[PDB]
Amino acid sequence: PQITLWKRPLVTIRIGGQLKEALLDTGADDTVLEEMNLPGKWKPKMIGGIGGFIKVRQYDQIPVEICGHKAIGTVLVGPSPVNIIGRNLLTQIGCTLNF
Amino acid sequence: PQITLWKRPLVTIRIGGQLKEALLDTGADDTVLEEMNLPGKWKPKMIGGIGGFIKVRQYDQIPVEICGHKAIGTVLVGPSPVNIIGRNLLTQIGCTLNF
Ligand SMILES: CC(C)(C)NC(=O)[C@@H]1C[C@@H]2CCCC[C@@H]2CN1C[C@@H](O)[C@H](Cc1ccccc1)NC(=O)[C@H](CC(N)=O)NC(=O)c1ccc2ccccc2n1
Numbered sequence: 317p318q319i320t321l322w323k324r325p326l327v328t329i330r331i332g333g334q335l336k337e338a339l340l341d342t343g344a345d346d347t348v349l350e351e352m353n354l355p356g357k358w359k360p361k362m363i364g365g366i367g368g369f370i371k372v373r374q375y376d377q378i379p380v381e382i383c384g385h386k387a388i389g390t391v392l393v394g395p396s397p398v399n400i401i402g403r404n405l406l407t408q409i410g411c412t413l414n415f
Numbered sequence: 416p417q418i419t420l421w422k423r424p425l426v427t428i429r430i431g432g433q434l435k436e437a438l439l440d441t442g443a444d445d446t447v448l449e450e451m452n453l454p455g456k457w458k459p460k461m462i463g464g465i466g467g468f469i470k471v472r473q474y475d476q477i478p479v480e481i482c483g484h485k486a487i488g489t490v491l492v493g494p495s496p497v498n499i500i501g502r503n504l505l506t507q508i509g510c511t512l513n514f
Contacts, residue, residue: 319512321502325441340512342424343440343499348465366447366464366495385514396465400442403420411514413418413439415484415505 317383329401330381331391336399338382342413344402347380348372348392363392370394385409416482417513428500429480430490435498437481441512443501446479447491453477462491469493484508 319325325340332354346363358373372394379388382401387408418424424439431453445462457472471493478487481500486507 317514321441321506321510321512324444324502325512339442341440341442342420342512343438343442345423363465364496365466366462366499367469368466370466397463400465403423406514407420409514411420411512413420413424413441413510414513415416415482415508415510 327383327401329383329399331378338399338401340382340406340411341400341402342406342411344400345404346392346400347390347402347405348394348396348400350393350396350399352393354378354391354393358393361392370396372396380405382409426482426500428482428498430477437498437500439481439505439510440499440501441505441510443499444503445491446489446501446504447471447493447495447499449492449495449498451492453490453492457492460491462493469495479504481508 326337329338358375361374362369372392378391387405428437453474457474460473461468471491474490477490486504
């Protein structure tokens with residue numbers, strides 16, 4: 317589809333079979349999720365943006381479906397106010413910026 | 416242009432007569448530039464990101480040229496590792512997300 321930027325580009329994703337709302341974020345290298353209790357091994361990581369760094373848990377090879385387009389890769393879980401879909405998964409769904 | 420996302424969507428902009436590299440960021444509501452001088456009055460403001468809140472200088476009605484496209488709007492100046500072009504300006508240049 318085509319997603320306009322008049323409002324935050326929030327879309328429904330499925331991860332762990334849960335449905336969530338998440339921000340399509342061309343400025344994010346990573347995919348960062350609101351705290352959720354995913355099973356599996358993880359590695360600690362620190363990621364940064366405006367305001368500083370937060371501690372997150374890195375889970376690998378997690379399926380994430382984005383408006384019906386399937387992806388699989390790394391998701392970082394921790395105390396973010398918003399679920400963010402970053403470039404690692406936006407590339408997998410063939411997302412471009414256009415103007 | 417059509418811009419893919421296997422690398423950061425960094426483009427050249429012109430602001431205040433100077434060229435800068437900036438990130439095309441669909442996740443950012445606002446446009447936030449690294450600390451610099453701009454002409455005119457500014458007002459103190461605060462904005463929040465993944466790592467928490469920062470103090471910024473708000474400049475209104477600033478012209479910014481983004482890959483040759485003209486925008487004129489609010490630019491926030493503050494401590495950042497990256498010059499970020501947010502939706503307030505992306506929408507002025509007709510930028511959408513597509514997949
Ligand atoms: C820019 C404003 C403040 C207007 N908005 C944001 O920061 C929004 C805020 C919402 C709500 C909180 C969670 C984050 C989301 C989306 N961000 C926008 C992002 O696109 C944001 C933009 C940004 C890029 C680079 C530096 C600072 C801000 N990106 C990130 O926060 C992500 C997190 C991540 N690791 O995926 N960051 C980066 O991609 C990144 C790249 C390079 C780099 C270099 C040095 C230091 C930090 C850093 N972060």
